[PDB]
mmCIF file with all atom_site columns, C-alpha atoms in Angstrom:
data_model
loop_
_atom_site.group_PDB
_atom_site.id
_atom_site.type_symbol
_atom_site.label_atom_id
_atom_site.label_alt_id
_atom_site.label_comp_id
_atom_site.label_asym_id
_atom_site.label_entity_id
_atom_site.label_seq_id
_atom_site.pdbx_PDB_ins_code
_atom_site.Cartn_x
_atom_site.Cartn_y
_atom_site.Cartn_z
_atom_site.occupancy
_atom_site.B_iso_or_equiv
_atom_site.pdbx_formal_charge
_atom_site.auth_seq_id
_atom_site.auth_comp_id
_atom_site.auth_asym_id
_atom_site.auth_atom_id
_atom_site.pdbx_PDB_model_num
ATOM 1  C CA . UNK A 1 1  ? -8.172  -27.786 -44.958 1.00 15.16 ? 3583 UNK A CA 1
ATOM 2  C CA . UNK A 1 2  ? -9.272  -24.156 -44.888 1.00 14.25 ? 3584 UNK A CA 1
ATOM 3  C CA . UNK A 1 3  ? -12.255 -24.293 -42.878 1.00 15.16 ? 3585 UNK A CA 1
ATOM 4  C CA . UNK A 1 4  ? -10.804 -25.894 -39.224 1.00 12.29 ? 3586 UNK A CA 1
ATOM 5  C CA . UNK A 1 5  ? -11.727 -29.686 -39.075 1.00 13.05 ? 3587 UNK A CA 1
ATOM 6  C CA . UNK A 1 6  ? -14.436 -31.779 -37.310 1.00 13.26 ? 3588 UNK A CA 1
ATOM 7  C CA . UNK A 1 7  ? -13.065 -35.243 -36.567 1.00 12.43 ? 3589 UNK A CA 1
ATOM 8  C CA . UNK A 1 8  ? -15.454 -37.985 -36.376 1.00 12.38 ? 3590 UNK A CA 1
ATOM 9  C CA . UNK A 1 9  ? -12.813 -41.115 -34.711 1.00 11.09 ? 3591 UNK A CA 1
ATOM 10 C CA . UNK A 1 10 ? -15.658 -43.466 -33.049 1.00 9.44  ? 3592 UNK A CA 1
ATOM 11 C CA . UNK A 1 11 ? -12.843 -46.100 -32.693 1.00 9.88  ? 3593 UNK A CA 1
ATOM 12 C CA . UNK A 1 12 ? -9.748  -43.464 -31.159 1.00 7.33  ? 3594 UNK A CA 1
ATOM 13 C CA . UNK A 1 13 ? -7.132  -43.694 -33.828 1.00 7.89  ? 3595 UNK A CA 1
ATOM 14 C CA . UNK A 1 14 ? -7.316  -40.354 -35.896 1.00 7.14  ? 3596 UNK A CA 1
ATOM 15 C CA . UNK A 1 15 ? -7.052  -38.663 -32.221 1.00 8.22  ? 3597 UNK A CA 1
ATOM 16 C CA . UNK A 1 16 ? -3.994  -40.715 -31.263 1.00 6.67  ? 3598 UNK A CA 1
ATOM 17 C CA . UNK A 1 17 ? -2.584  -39.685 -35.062 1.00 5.83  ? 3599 UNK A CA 1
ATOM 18 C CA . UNK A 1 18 ? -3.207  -36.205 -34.349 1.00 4.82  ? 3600 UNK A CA 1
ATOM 19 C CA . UNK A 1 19 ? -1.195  -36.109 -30.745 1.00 5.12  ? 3601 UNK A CA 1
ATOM 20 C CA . UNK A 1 20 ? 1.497   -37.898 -32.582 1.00 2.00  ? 3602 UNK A CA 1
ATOM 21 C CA . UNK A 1 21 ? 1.617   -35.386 -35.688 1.00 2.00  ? 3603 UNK A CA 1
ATOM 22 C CA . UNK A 1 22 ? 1.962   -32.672 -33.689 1.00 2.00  ? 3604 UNK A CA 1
ATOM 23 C CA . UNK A 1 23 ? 3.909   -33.331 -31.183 1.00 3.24  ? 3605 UNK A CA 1
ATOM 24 C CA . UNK A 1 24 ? 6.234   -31.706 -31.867 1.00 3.49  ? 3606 UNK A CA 1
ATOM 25 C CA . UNK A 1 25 ? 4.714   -28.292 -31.791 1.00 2.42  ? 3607 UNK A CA 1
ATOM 26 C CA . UNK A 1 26 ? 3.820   -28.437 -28.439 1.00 5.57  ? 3608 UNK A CA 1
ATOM 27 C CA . UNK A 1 27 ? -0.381  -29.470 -28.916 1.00 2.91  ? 3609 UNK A CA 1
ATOM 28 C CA . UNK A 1 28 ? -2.539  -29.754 -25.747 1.00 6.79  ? 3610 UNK A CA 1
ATOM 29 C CA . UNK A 1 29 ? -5.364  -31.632 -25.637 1.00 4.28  ? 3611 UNK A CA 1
ATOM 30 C CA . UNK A 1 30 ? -8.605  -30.068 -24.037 1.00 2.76  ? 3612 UNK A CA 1
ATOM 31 C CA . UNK A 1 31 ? -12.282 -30.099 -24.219 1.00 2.86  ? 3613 UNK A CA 1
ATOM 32 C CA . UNK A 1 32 ? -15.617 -28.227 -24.295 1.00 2.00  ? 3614 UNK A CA 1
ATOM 33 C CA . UNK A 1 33 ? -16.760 -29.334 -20.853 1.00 2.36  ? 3615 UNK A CA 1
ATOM 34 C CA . UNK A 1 34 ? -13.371 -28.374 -18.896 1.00 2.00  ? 3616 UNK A CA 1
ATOM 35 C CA . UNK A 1 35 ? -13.505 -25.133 -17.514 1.00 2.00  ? 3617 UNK A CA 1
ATOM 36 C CA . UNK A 1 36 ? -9.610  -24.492 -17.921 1.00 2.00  ? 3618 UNK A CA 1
ATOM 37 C CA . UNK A 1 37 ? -10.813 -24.313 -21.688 1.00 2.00  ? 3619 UNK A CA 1
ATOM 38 C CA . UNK A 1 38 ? -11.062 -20.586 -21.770 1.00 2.00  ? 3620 UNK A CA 1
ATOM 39 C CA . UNK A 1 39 ? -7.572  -20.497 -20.666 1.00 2.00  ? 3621 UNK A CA 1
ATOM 40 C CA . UNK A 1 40 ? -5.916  -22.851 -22.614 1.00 2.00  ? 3622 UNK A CA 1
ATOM 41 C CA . UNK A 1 41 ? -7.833  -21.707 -25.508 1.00 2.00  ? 3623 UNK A CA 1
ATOM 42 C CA . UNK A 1 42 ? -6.685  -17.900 -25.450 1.00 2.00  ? 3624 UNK A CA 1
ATOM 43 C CA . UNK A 1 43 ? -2.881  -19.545 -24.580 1.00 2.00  ? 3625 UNK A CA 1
ATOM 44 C CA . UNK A 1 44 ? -3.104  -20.434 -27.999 1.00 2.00  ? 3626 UNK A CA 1
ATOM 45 C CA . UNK A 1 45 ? -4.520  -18.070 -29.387 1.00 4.86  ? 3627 UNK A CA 1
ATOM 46 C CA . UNK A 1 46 ? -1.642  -15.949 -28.260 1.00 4.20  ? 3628 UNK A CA 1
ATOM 47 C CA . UNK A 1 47 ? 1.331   -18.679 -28.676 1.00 6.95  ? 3629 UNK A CA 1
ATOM 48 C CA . UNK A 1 48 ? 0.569   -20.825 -32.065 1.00 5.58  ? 3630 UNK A CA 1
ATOM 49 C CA . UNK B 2 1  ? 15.653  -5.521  -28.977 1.00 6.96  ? 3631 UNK B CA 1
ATOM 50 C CA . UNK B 2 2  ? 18.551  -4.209  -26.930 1.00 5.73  ? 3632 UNK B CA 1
ATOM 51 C CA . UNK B 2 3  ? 17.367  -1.349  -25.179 1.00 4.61  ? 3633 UNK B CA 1
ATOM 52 C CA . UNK B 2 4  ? 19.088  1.735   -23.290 1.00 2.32  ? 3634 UNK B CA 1
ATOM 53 C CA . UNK B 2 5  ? 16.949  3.757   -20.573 1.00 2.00  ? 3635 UNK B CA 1
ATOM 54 C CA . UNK B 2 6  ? 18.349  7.040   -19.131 1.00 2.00  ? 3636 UNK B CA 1
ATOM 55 C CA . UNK B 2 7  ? 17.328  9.164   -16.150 1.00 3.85  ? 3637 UNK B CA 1
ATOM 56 C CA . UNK B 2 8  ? 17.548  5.764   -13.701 1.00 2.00  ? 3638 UNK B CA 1
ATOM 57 C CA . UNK B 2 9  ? 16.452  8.210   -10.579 1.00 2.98  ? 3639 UNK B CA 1
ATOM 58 C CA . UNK B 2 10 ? 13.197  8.292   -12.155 1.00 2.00  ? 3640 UNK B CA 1
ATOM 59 C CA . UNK B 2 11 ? 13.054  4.557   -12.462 1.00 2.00  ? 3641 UNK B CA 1
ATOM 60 C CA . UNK B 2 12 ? 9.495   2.949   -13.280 1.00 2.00  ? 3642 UNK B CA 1
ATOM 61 C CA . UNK B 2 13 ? 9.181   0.094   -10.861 1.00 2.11  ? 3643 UNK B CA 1
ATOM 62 C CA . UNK B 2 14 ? 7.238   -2.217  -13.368 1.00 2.00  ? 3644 UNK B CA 1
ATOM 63 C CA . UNK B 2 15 ? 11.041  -3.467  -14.811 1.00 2.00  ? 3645 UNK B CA 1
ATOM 64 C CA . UNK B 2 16 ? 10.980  -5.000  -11.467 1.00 2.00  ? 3646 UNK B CA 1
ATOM 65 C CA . UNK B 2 17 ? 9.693   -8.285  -12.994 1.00 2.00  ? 3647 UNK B CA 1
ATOM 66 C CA . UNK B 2 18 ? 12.120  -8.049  -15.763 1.00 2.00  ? 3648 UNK B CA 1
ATOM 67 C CA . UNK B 2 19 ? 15.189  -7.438  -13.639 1.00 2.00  ? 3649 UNK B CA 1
ATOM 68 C CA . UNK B 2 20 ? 14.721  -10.129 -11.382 1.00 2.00  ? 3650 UNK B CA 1
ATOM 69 C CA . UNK B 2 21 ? 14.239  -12.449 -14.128 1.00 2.00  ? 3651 UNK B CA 1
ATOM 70 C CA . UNK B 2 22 ? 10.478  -13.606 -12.827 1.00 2.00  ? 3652 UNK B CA 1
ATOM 71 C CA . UNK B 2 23 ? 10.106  -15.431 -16.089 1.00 2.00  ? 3653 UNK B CA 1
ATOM 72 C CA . UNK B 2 24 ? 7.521   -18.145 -16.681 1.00 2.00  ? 3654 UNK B CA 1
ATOM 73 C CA . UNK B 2 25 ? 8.534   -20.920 -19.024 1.00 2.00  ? 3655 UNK B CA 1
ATOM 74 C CA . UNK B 2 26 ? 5.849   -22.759 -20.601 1.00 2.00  ? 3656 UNK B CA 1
ATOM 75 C CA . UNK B 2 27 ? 4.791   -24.640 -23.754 1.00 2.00  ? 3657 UNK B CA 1
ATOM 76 C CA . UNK B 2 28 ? 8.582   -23.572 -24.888 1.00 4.77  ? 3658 UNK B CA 1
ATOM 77 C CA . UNK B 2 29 ? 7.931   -19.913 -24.843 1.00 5.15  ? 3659 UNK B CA 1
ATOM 78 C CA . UNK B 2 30 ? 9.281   -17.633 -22.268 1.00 6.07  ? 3660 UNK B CA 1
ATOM 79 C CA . UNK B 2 31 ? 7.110   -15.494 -20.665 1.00 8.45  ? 3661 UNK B CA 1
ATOM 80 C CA . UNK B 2 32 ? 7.388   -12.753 -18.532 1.00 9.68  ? 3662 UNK B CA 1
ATOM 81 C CA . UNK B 2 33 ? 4.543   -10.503 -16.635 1.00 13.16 ? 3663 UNK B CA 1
ATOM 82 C CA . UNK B 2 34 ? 5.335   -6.685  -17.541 1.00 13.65 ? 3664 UNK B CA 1
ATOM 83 C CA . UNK B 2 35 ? 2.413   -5.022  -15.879 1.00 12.15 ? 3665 UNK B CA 1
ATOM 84 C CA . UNK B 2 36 ? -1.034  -7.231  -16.651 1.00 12.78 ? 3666 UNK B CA 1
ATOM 85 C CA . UNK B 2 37 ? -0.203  -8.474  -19.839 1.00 10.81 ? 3667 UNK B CA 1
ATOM 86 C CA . UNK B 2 38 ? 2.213   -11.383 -20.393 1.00 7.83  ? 3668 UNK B CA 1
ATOM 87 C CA . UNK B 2 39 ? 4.748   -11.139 -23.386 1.00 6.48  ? 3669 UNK B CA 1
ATOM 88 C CA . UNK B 2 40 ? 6.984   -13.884 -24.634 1.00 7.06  ? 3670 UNK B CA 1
ATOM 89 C CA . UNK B 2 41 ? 10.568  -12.623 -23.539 1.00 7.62  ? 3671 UNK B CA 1
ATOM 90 C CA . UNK B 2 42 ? 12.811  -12.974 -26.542 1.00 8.27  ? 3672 UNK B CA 1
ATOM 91 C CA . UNK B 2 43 ? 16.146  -14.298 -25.331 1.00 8.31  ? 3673 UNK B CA 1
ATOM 92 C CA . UNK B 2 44 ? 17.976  -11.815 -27.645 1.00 10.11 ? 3674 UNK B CA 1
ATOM 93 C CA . UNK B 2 45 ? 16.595  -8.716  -25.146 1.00 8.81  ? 3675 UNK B CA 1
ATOM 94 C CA . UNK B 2 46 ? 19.055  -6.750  -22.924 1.00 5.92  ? 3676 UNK B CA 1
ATOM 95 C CA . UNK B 2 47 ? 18.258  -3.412  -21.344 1.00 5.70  ? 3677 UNK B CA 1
ATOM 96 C CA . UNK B 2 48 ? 21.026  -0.959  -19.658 1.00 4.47  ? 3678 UNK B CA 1
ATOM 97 C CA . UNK B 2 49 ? 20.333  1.204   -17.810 1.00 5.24  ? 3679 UNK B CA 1
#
């Protein structure tokens, strides 16, 4: 991709692929109504 | 970088944090709070002073 991508997973697999993918590099999942998502959002921002 | 400081009488209390080795792990990065900005401490540093 070169434009950041916009998963549509109704049944929960592609998210569950994308944990297991990367793994390894440390990803966090978060979401738009959290309120820790300003932090964890300019964590990576700073850290890959 | 290894870095050497001279003039210690003068010392700048903000290595205080980096002295005592008040590092933050997290996410696999080290992280350490010089001042109000946090940097990821490279384990390669050393400083003399």
């Amino acid at each position: 991709f070169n434009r950041y991508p916009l998963i549509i997973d109704p049944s929960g697999q592609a998210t569950e692929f994308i944990m297991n993918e990367y793994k390894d590099r440390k990803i966090t999942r978060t979401s738009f109504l959290d309120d820790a998502f300003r932090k964890n959002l300019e964590s990576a921002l700073r850290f890959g | 970088n290894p870095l050497l400081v001279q003039d210690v009488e003068s010392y700048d209390p903000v290595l205080n944090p980096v002295l005592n080795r008040e590092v933050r792990r997290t996410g696999g990065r080290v992280l350490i709070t010089l001042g109000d900005q946090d940097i990821d401490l490279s384990p390669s540093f050393v400083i003399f002073l």
